[PDB]
Amino acid sequence: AMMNALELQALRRIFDMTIEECTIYITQDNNSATWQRWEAGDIPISPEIIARLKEMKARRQRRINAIVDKINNRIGNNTMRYFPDLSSFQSIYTEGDFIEWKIYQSVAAELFAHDLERLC
Amino acid sequence: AMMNALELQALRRIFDMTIEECTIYITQDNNSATWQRWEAGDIPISPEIIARLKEMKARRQRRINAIVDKINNRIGNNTMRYFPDLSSFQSIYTEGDFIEWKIYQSVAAELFAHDLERLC
């Protein structure tokens, strides 16, 4: 089944992004009007954007899998940085962009919620 | 180690709540300044509040585990309702409150991110 309006809203929250940020980094056209129409279900989501979002979900899962793989393959105090803003993220990942930062943050928050990592 | 400012920010965002909502529904002190200072790391978080946050974290994990544990035996498509506002949430969970709603939504978004449930 085609990605629907509710799932779009859910993804935005999973990645902790505002509609404005989605129009800047995902659709890359600053068109908030169209994005709101999508979340309102007035019109179907552009197939091209669905594909972009699905690749973000995939990147997120691979990131989580990679970290979890290292956790249960080792033992000890697992702690990871949590970056409130992009600049703090770039102090460590000097080549990281906004989307990379949001994916990282989403993963860090989930891992902490599952009691798998402490944040620093 | 006691819960720190970063973990407090992480939980607020995974539950998709604004600071104002946290002051009304979690601390119930209606004082954003206090919460902002906690997220800024200026003042340690009140132990009472840390406890409340850990319980929400525990409730979240319990709901996730309960659902994922029965996915393979579920009859029909793996779909889950996504509720945009508290009122819609209460049309199903008639005794549902703000906190249960936020926790539910967090769980729904995660399961969708993990491709375990489609949202409707």
Query: Which domains are assigned to chain A?
Result: 1-120 (1.10.3100.10)
Which of B7, B9, B61 should we substitute to test contact with A (largest number of A Cβ atoms within 10 Å)? B7
Alpha carbon of A59: minimum distance to chain B alpha carbons (Å)? 11
SS3 sequence of A44-61 = CCCHHHHHHHHHHHHHHH
* A13:B110 CB<8 A: no
How many helices (H) and strands (E) chain B has is answered by: 6, 2
Structural method: X-ray
**Which chain B residues are within 8 Å of A61, Cβ to Cβ?**
113-115
Element containing residue B87 per DSSP (H, E) = helix B86-90
Tokens linked to A56: 């973000």
d(CA B13, CA B5) in angstroms, rounded, equals 13
Tokens linked to A113: 């919620």
* B6:A113 CB<8 A: no
Q: Which of A32, A8, A37 is nearest to A20 (CA)?
A: A32
**B29 CB within 8 Å of a chain A CB:** no
d(CA B31, CA B39) in angstroms, rounded, equals 13
Resolution stated for this PDB structure, in Å: 1.9
Alpha carbon of B14: minimum distance to chain A alpha carbons (Å)? 6
Tokens linked to B60: 């979240």
Cβ atoms of residues A102 and A16 within 8 Å: yes
Tokens linked to B92: 């199903």
d(CA A35, CA A43) in angstroms, rounded, equals 10
Q: How many CB atoms lie within 10 A of CB B60?
A: 21
Cβ atoms of residues A50 and A44 within 8 Å: no
d(CA A67, CA A65) in angstroms, rounded, equals 6
Amino acid of residue B15: F
DSSP B45: P
